[PDB]
Structures are given as C-alpha cells and as structure tokens.
C-alpha cells in the first residue's frame, strides 16, 4: 500500500475535557457537519497527487458519528463514502465502509482487495463530526473531530500486526462502547453516549503497545495515533488525525516506507500496517 | 513449461459451508403489526411479492447476535471447523442498532458501537481470527465473500467465516408503507483455501453510483403518521430513476463475466438479491437468464437486506437447483447505491 497523498481538515475549535482519558481535542461546533471538512481534505489529497475524481477506483470510509455527516444532518445511512462519491464526481468508484475498524486494519484489508482487483487509485477516509455523541464526562474521553483522506495505490505487499496494549500484562482493559440514547426527545439530541471507563494507565499502555508493535519492524520509522492528552504537550491530541503531520514529515524527509500504528478502543488493541510513501 | 522458473498462483477459494437462521415468528400481510400502515391494497402486496416475513422477537431471546451464535456454532460443528483455525471473521449488519453482546459484554443493551465481529469472535472462541465489520447494505454478503476471497487468494487467510445479520425491523416505521417489505434474518458462510480446482471465485465486479443516495436512507425522525408523544428514532426513510437499478445489476454481471472470460450461456444458475419480482426479472432478462435458472424467494421471508442472497443460494443448493460443479452468478444491488456480481465455480457446498 503506497500513500500517494494525505489530506487533513480539522475544525479550528478545540475543547478541553478533564479526566485521566481527557485532553484538548478538535470539536465541531453548531451544526457543522463532516462533509464540510471531508470534501476539502479529499480534494487536497487529489490535488497533491494530480489524480482526478474520475480516476478513483475505490472509496472506503470510517466514521462513527451518527448524525452531522452531510447537509441533511439527520441522515446516518448510507454512510458518508456515498455522498462523498456524489459530490466528488468519482463516477467509476466502488464505495463501502469498514465501520469501527482502525485505520491500520482498514488499510491492510483495502490493500488486499484493491491490489487483487487491479485498482490503481483508492481513497481511504476517516472523519468525525461527533455532536451526536455525548462525551464521557467521567473519564474525559471524547473523539477528535475532523477529516483525514489517504489517497493510496495498492500493492498487496502491506504487512499487518494486531498487538496487545502494554503496561500491566494482567490488566484487563475496559473497552469503549457507544450505547444508544434511550431518551431521545428531539431530533437534535445525542443519539449515543461515549463510554470509556476512567483508566489512568490506559494512555501509557497504548503508547507502550505501539512501541512493542514497532519492534516487529525495527528497520521502519513509524507514525501513530494519539487518542489521549495525558503526557502530551498542552494535553492536546488529534486522535487518528495526528497521523497527517507525521506522514507529511516522513514525506519531507523522503522516507520510502514506514509503519502506521492505530489504537482500536473497541478491541483495546493496537494495529499496525506497513506502507510505501510517495 | 512456460518458464524455467515457476509462476506464482493465487489460491483457489472454496465456498465450503453455508447456513441461515430466520426468525421463529412469521407475520402475514393482514397481521395486526400493519394496522397503522396507510394506503395498503392487494395490488401493493401482489406487486412486491412478499406474502409473509419474519421479525426477531427479542423478548424471547432472538436478536442479531443470539441467532448468529446459534448458526455459526452449528456451522462450525457441522463443517468440523476448529474455532482456532478461523483466520478472519467478517461481519455485516445493515441496521446501525445492535442489541446483544452475549457473555462478552453482558451489560450492554441497545448500542451503535462496537459492531459484531470482535465480540462474536470472543463468544465463539475464534482465538486466531482477525475481526472485521464491513458495510455495503444489501450487497454485504457479496462484499464479504470478495474480501474473504482476496485474503485467501493472497495467502493472508486460510479459513474465513462470513456473517450477515439483519435486524432491519428495529428501523422500520410501522406507521408507514415503508415497513411492509423488509424483514430480519441471519446467514453464515465459511470460505477456505481450496485444495483442488473444484471451487473458485472466477471473477467479481463491484461498482457504486450515488446519484440517488438520498432516496433510501436511515434518518433520525418522527414517525410518518405519529400518535401521542412519539419520540424520534432511526428509521428507514424513502424519499420520492426508473431504469437505474434494473440496468446496473446487469452492468455488474457483464463486467464480472467479461473478467472471467465467460458468457451468460456458460452459467448454470443465477442467485439474485430479492427486492421485488419485477426487479429480479429485469436483472435476469438483462443478462439472458431464464426463469428456470433462478429462484424468487422473498415470498415467505420478506426482503432480508444482505441475507436475501445467501438465503437464496442456500435454497438453491438445498433444493438441487444448484449442483456441484455448477458455474453460477450471484448478483445484487444495495442502497447508496452499490452493485456487485460474482462468477463462481462451485464444488460441494455443505448446507447445514
């Protein structure tokens, strides 16, 4: 899997939440919706790669947000890859969604499908406009809002690892869940609640899991997602959108290959995929 | 030989086993569940081809998870598949609302996330399975077969368990005619690396077109014809194109056949998604399939979104319409919209 170009577009609005799993993260405001950030992120990647929308073979989306996806803020399905196809004019593409997958796992699976089918230009997009999810005020956990676009050329050569979190090996980590709001009264109310129990050692356990997984490919430089503010400068973190600056630094430094590592809060694992770089 | 060296070969993909699990209770077209639906008529019922359909009964322990556990355990046992030999589990569920996580997350009730594969892998003891949850609405069974096949072909998995579980009834607005056709059900299939050429996925073609994305959606809204203090819910919603779906499934089939180097005359049998008799017939006529080469199965099940195709495949195998050695085409449409077709050489498929 070769990364041709990266696009990223985050809201300018940051919100700080206290708690062991808190931090300062980008947060969409008002009735901002995901497409207003996703479309410019995608166009930035296509422009960098000199790839026209009609040349896109495949669009695969990742977005948990249950509303505020598109102009009609009440639509949850079909998922955002489809309206993206429409507004982009990617009239030859196949579209699907990999729901709560990590980006690393999605990139591995898509490298496999797309190389097998002979595709040349594949868009993997990740975004949130999470106004419809209640943050976890007990732990401080919230999703970062924004959009990340990876324009990729498949090779079928990407390698993959799914690894344990670090820290106490006898620690049972309690996963993220998003229960449905059982008391929706107005169409604009939250549709679900983020629930990630307060676990003070979790941010460090994730980072230790990253470092362990990176040891499977010691020859490779690597990039990673930062879902928590703990121990980060100013408590600021961008979740999976942290990957954009790291990938761009790798391009500036003319790296040809790298390892990309995701944190999956549902599985409480880390997942890595090896990549080529333009 | 062609070269002094040996050419690499993609692994053959065996469709090894399949089963389905449907709701215990069936609802006829005059069932009181439809008492608040307006504008019904015998012409409506006769047109869509559904005479009865099933909805999960969660009060009696039926839901998208429990019936999958039952079906998958049955298939693993019947196919003699050790849980630890499954390398990947690919699940789909078109309703965003899940309701049960078994013994894995026993306190979780209605939920948007997580999806199914990770919790199901733990419930079934699939200790080596990479879990994936994919979404292509009514074409998800085909998408999952395609994902599985590519993993197997490239040597990245040797056994892949595929699950589709449709709890669509938890999104249906029963004050609206939109509630009258869709229905619940589950399907499980096992794909493996083939040990001979008796079975393989010869080719597939997937494509999407979002021109009419807004026509068929899941939207947070009040009921169409509410009563009292109705609350907003996530509902299947239909907004107000004639030839779009009739033509695009044949487009996908023609592309898949071309990639396989075959024509429709080379195909023994066809398996279609089951949205309506007129649509299945239009797809068949668009590719040259005669009525003796496919079944209409929505009459007694309703339109089970992604489960219609695997149910219809299973029916054809069970009834002897599809035989070992047959070449078949499986094809359907999905909201979004998406289209998928697959050309299979089938061997012996275990129906369990």
UniProtKB/Swiss-Prot annotation, chain A:
Places the protein is found: Cytoplasm
Single biological process term from Gene Ontology: secondary metabolite biosynthetic process
Protein's UniProt keywords contain Cytoplasm: yes
Top-level taxon of origin: Bacteria
Bridged cysteine pairs (disulfide): none
Single GO MF annotation: acyltransferase activity
UniProt keyword Chloroplast, yes or no: no
GO CC, alphabetical: cytoplasm
Regulation of its function: Activity of the complex is inhibited by 2-aminoacetophenone (2-AA).
Keywords assigned: Cytoplasm
Role noted for this protein: Required for the biosynthesis of the quorum-sensing signaling molecules 2-heptyl-4(1H)-quinolone (HHQ) and 2-heptyl-3-hydroxy-4(1H)-quinolone (Pseudomonas quinolone signal or PQS), which are important for biofilm formation and virulence. The PqsC/PqsB complex catalyzes the condensation of 2-aminobenzoylacetate (2-ABA) and octanoyl-CoA to form HHQ. PqsB, together with PqsC, catalyzes the coupling of 2-ABA with the octanoate group, leading to decarboxylation and dehydration, and resulting in closure of the quinoline ring.
Family: Belongs to the thiolase-like superfamily. FabH family.
Quaternary context: Forms a tight complex with PqsC.
Protein name, per record: 2-heptyl-4(1H)-quinolone synthase subunit PqsB
Organism: Pseudomonas aeruginosa (strain ATCC 15692 / DSM 22644 / CIP 104116 / JCM 14847 / LMG 12228 / 1C / PRS 101 / PAO1)
Classification lineage: Bacteria, Pseudomonadati, Pseudomonadota, Gammaproteobacteria, Pseudomonadales
Gene designation: pqsB
Curated annotation (Swiss-Prot), chain B:
Main location: cytoplasm
Known EC number: 2.3.1.230
Control of this protein's activity: Folding of PqsC and binding of octanoate are promoted by PqsB. Binding of the octanoyl group probably increases the binding affinity of the complex for 2-ABA. Activity of the complex is inhibited by 2-aminoacetophenone (2-AA).
Domain of life: Bacteria
Any single biological process term in GO: secondary metabolite biosynthetic process
Localization per record: Cytoplasm
GO function terms (MF aspect): 3-oxoacyl-[acyl-carrier-protein] synthase activity
Active site: 138, 273
Reactions that this protein is recorded to catalyse: (2-aminobenzoyl)acetate + octanoyl-CoA + H(+) = 2-heptyl-4(1H)-quinolone + CO2 + CoA + H2O
Keywords noted in UniProt: Acyltransferase, Cytoplasm, Transferase
GO CC, one annotated term: cytoplasm
Function: Required for the biosynthesis of the quorum-sensing signaling molecules 2-heptyl-4(1H)-quinolone (HHQ) and 2-heptyl-3-hydroxy-4(1H)-quinolone (Pseudomonas quinolone signal or PQS), which are important for biofilm formation and virulence. The PqsC/PqsB complex catalyzes the condensation of 2-aminobenzoylacetate (2-ABA) and octanoyl-CoA to form HHQ. First, PqsC acquires an octanoyl group from octanoyl-CoA and forms an octanoyl-PqsC intermediate.
Family that this chain belongs to: Belongs to the thiolase-like superfamily. FabH family.
Subunit structure: Forms a tight complex with PqsB.
Name under which the protein is recorded: 2-heptyl-4(1H)-quinolone synthase subunit PqsC
Organism: Pseudomonas aeruginosa (strain ATCC 15692 / DSM 22644 / CIP 104116 / JCM 14847 / LMG 12228 / 1C / PRS 101 / PAO1)
Upper classification of the organism: Bacteria, Pseudomonadati, Pseudomonadota, Gammaproteobacteria, Pseudomonadales
């Amino acid at each position: 899997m070769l990364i041709q170009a990266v696009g990223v577009n985050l809201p300018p609005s940051y919100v700080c939440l206290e708690g062991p799993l808190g931090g300062e993260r980008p947060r969409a405001q008002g009735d901002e919706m995901l497409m207003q950030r996703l479309l410019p992120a995608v166009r930035e990647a296509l422009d960098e790669a000199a790839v026209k929308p009609e040349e896109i073979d495949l669009i695969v989306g990742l977005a948990l947000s249950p509303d505020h996806l598109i102009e009609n803020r009440d639509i949850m399905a079909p998922k955002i890859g489809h309206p993206l196809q429409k507004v982009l004019g990617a009239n030859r593409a196949h579209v699907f969604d990999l729901t709560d997958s990590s980006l690393a796992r999605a990139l591995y699976v898509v490298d496999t499908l797309a190389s097998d089918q002979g595709y040349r230009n594949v868009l993997v997009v990740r975004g949130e406009s999470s106004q419809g999810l209640e943050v976890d005020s007990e732990s401080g956990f919230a999703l970062a809002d924004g959009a990340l676009a990876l324009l990729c050329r498949p090779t079928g050569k990407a390698a993959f690892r799914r690894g344990a979190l670090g820290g106490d090996p006898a620690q049972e980590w309690l996963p993220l869940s998003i229960p449905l709001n059982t008391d929706i009264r107005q169409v604009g109310d939250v549709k679900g609640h983020l629930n990630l129990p307060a676990q003070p050692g979790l941010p460090e356990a994730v980072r230790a899991g990253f470092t362990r997984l990176a040891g499977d490919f010691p020859q490779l430089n690597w990039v990673r997602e930062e879902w928590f503010g703990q121990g980060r400068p100013d408590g600021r973190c961008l979740g999976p959108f942290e990957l954009a600056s790291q990938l761009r630094a790798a391009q500036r430094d003319r790296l040809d290959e790298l390892l990309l590592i995701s944190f999956d809060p549902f599985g409480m694992v880390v997942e890595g995929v090896t990549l080529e770089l333009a | 030989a062609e070269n002094l060296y040996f050419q690499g070969h993609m692994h053959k993909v065996k469709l090894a086993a399949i089963t389905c699990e449907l709701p215990a209770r069936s609802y006829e077209n005059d069932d009181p569940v439809f008492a608040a639906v307006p504008d019904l008529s015998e012409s409506w019922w006769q047109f869509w081809g559904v005479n009865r359909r099933g909805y999960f009964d969660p009060r009696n322990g039926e839901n998208e998870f429990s019936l999958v556990v039952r079906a998958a355990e049955r298939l693993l046992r019947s196919s003699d598949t050790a849980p630890d030999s499954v390398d990947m589990l690919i699940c789909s569920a078109s309703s965003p609302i899940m309701t049960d996580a078994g013994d894995v997350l026993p306190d979780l009730r209605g939920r948007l996330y997580p999806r199914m594969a990770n919790v199901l892998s733990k419930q079934l003891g699939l200790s080596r399975a990479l879990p994936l949850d994919s979404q292509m609405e009514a074409a998800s069974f085909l998408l999952n077969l395609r994902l599985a096949a590519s993993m197997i072909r490239q040597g990245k998995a040797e056994k892949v368990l595929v699950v589709c579980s449709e709890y669509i009834s938890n999104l249906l607005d029963f004050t609206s005619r939109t509630s009258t056709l869709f229905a619940d059900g589950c399907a499980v299939a096992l794909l493996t690396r083939g040990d001979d050429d008796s079975c393989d996925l010869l080719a597939s073609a997937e494509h999407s077109d979002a021109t009419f994305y807004e026509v068929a959606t899941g939207r947070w809204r009040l009921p169409e014809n509410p009563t009292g203090e109705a609350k907003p819910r996530l509902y299947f919603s239909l907004f107000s194109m004639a030839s779009f779906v009739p033509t695009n499934v044949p487009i996908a089939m023609r592309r898949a056949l071309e990639k396989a180097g075959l024509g429709s005359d080379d195909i023994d049998y066809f398996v279609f998604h089951q949205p309506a008799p007129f649509l299945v017939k239009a797809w068949a006529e668009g590719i040259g399939a005669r009525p003796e080469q496919y079944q209409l199965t929505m009459g007694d099940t309703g339109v089970m979104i992604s489960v219609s195709i695997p149910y219809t495949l299973m029916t054809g195998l069970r009834e002897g319409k599809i035989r070992p050695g047959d070449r078949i085409v499986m094809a359907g449409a999905a909201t979004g919209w998406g289209f998928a077709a697959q050309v299979w050489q089938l061997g012996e498929v275990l129906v369990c």
